[PDB]
């Protein structure tokens, strides 16, 4: 798991969650990441984000098709 790729995907998760749900979570870092080869790659991320300036953990599921510029936030939730 290339940590640079995962950092970008974690930021994309927080940004997509903010777009989708009209929120303002502030990305802090990735804690955990699992890649699972599928039709493309599926990522299960555990990350820190600040809610109201309060650090919290979230789980995100991110689907990537590396042959297109396709990245999709499948789910995002507190742990």
């Amino acid at each position: 798991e290339n940590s640079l790729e995962i950092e970008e995907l974690a930021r994309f998760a927080v940004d997509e969650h903010n777009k989708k749900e009209n929120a303002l979570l502030e990305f802090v870092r990735v804690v955990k990441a699992k890649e699972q080869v599928v039709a493309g790659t599926m990522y299960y991320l555990t990350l820190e984000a600040k809610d109201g300036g309060k650090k919290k953990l979230y789980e995100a599921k991110v689907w990537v098709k590396p042959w297109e510029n396709f990245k999709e936030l499948q789910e995002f939730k507190p742990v």
Binding site: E1, N2, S3, I6, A33, K34, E35, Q36, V37, V38, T41, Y43
Partner: protein, 368 residues
């Protein structure tokens, strides 16, 4: 200070090498369900997708090294109480085609480990993902679509309390990658096959349990109005008749608690069940200890008079079928304190001093 950058050692085309720590490139997490059945895909992904989302010492070396002369070692550290046991089979195949069969028969050919967690604490095996050369790469196996498949061939004889996990540790050892190439020479010294002769269930009880597996192996194994095929089994059916020293590898699939003693012998189909004199024939007894799980029967050239046919017509009965069978007969009785069948897996590893005669037009069907 300055230096000439063109003449540095940045075009190092070494293979990946070092200790087992510094050659590890991925770990994989297989989930074994509390109640899993036989013929049950646990994991099935491309061998290159193993390495996605990984950060071990040789992960980046593995991806970026253009040529790798070493084999891939995979070790599986799964265990369970002696009370229970099952039979897992990890297996590597050079590719796929849509809606494929994942029956043990189909898979095992080529490169595979089979083990019973109940007996063996861990199990490792090396292999070459390019079967017709001395070398390979990460880019070769990503685009070639090399496919790793873990399958459960026999369920848990006694289920554990919770779900289980098998950790696979993919490394690169430093053995030479030797190729396994099949060819049409009539006499060959060692024709490997890894042909799944079949899973033998023997129920608990007192009855005369006899199981025949035919040595007319060619023309695949059965399905509905269909049949399955390995390459090596399709390859041996190129010839009409054949012979050789047959090297079976019989494996325990149940737990150590289900105990049984098994005679193996070559003989012809006409012999009925409830014929009580099987030990007139030359035979081999197979008792398993608690810890032993694997045993190799060999049947020399003196067990066969002539060559026999690779395929037989499907509609020939046991009464008129003049090719030899491999009998597996319960010497005493299947026993145990816990309920569960005595499963036992026979696998024709290969034929030594193989001699292939003629040229098979073909038959179309499987069993005899």
């Amino acid at each position: 200070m300055e230096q000439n950058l063109f003449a540095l050692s940045l075009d190092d085309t070494s293979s990946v090498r070092g200790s087992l720590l510094d050659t590890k490139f991925a770990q994989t997490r297989v989930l074994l369900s509390k109640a899993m059945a036989g013929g049950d895909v646990l994991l099935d992904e491309y061998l290159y997708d193993v390495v996605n989302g990984q950060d071990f010492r040789a992960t980046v070396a593995f991806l970026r090294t253009h040529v790798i002369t070493g084999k891939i070692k995979v070790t599986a550290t799964t265990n369970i109480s002696d009370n229970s046991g099952c039979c897992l089979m990890l297996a590597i195949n050079s590719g796929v085609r849509g809606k494929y069969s994942t029956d043990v028969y189909t898979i095992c050919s080529q490169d595979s480990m089979t083990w019973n967690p109940g007996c063996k604490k861990n199990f490792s095996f090396t292999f070459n993902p390019n079967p017709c050369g001395d070398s390979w790469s990460a880019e070769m196996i990503s685009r070639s679509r090399v496919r790793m498949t873990v399958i459960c061939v026999s369920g848990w004889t006694l289920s554990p309390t919770t779900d289980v996990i098998a950790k696979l540790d993919w490394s690169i050892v430093n053995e030479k990658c030797e190729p396994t190439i099949y060819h049409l020479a009539d006499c060959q010294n060692w024709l490997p096959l890894n042909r799944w002769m079949g899973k033998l269930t023997f129920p608990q009880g007192v009855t005369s349990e006899v199981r025949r597996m035919p040595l007319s192996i060619g023309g695949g194994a059965g399905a509905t109005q269909a049949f399955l095929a390995n390459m090596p089994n399709s390859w041996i059916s190129m010839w009409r008749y054949f012979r050789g020293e047959l090297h079976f590898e019989v494996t325990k699939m149940s737990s150590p608690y289900i105990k049984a003693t098994v005679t193996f012998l070559i003989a012809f189909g006409n012999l009925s069940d409830a014929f009580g004199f099987y030990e007139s024939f030359p035979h081999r007894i197979v008792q398993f200890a608690e810890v032993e799980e694997k045993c190799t029967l060999v049947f020399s050239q003196q067990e066969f008079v002539t060559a026999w046919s690779t395929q037989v017509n499907p509609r020939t009965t046991l009464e008129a079928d003049g090719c030899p069978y491999l009998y597996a007969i319960i010497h005493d009785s299947t026993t145990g304190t816990i309920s569960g069948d005595f499963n036992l897996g026979v696998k024709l590893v290969g034929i030594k001093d193989f001699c292939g005669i003629g040229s098979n037009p073909g038959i179309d069907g499987s069993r005899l």
